[PDB]
Every structure is written in C-alpha cells, then in structure tokens.
C-alpha cells in the first residue's frame, strides 16, 4: 500500500496534469479528505507489527 515514482513509466523530465474533479473514494478513514487547501501536513505512526 505505497506509491513509487517508477509507476509513471517514463525515465527523463516531464510535467503532470492531475484530475482533481475525478478523485474516487476507494478506502475512507475519518482522516480522508477530498479537497486539499494550501500546505498539506501528514504525520503517521506505525505500531503493533505481527
């Protein structure tokens, strides 16, 4: 459940046009928001490995 930059599948330089209207909601916790505004800060902690 992570994103690597190699998923773009293009070595070299480019600019991306992100579709902000068609943002689907697959898995939603209470944290999950659709409309970001300004400077986005996300602080997560991982505990209880099994």
């Amino acid at each position: 459940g992570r994103f690597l930059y190699t998923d773009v599948k293009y070595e070299g330089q480019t600019a991306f046009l992100v579709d902000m209207d068609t943002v689907k909601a697959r898995d939603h916790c209470w944290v999950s928001i659709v409309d970001p505004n300004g400077t986005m800060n996300l602080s997560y902690k991982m505990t209880n490995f099994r």
Partner: protein, 50 residues
C-alpha cells in the same frame, strides 16, 4: 551460512520448525496499525487505520 541469513529476519518475527507448503504461490507480510494526523489551511483532521 545460517547465522548470516537468520539475522536478515525482523526482530519481532521468530518462525516455528515445520511449514506445510501445499501450493506454487505464498504471500508473506505483516498486519500493522497506522495513526494518521492531517493539517492544512482549512483545518485539522485525525484518523486511524486499525
């Protein structure tokens, strides 16, 4: 070299003796708990993936 390859396993995991493999495919992973905290110009939101 047992002592070398035994060190690579994570500190929390200690596997048992036998393993009855009955297929040509095995998934291996862990069940972690994520405690996310979001902050932007609109406001704050706190969640938790159990």
């Amino acid at each position: 070299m047992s002592s070398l390859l035994n060190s690579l396993l994570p500190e929390y995991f200690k596997p048992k003796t036998n393993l009855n493999i009955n297929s040509s495919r095995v998934q291996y992973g862990f069940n972690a708990r994520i405690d996310m905290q979001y902050e932007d110009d609109s406001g704050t939101r706190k969640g938790s993936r159990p």
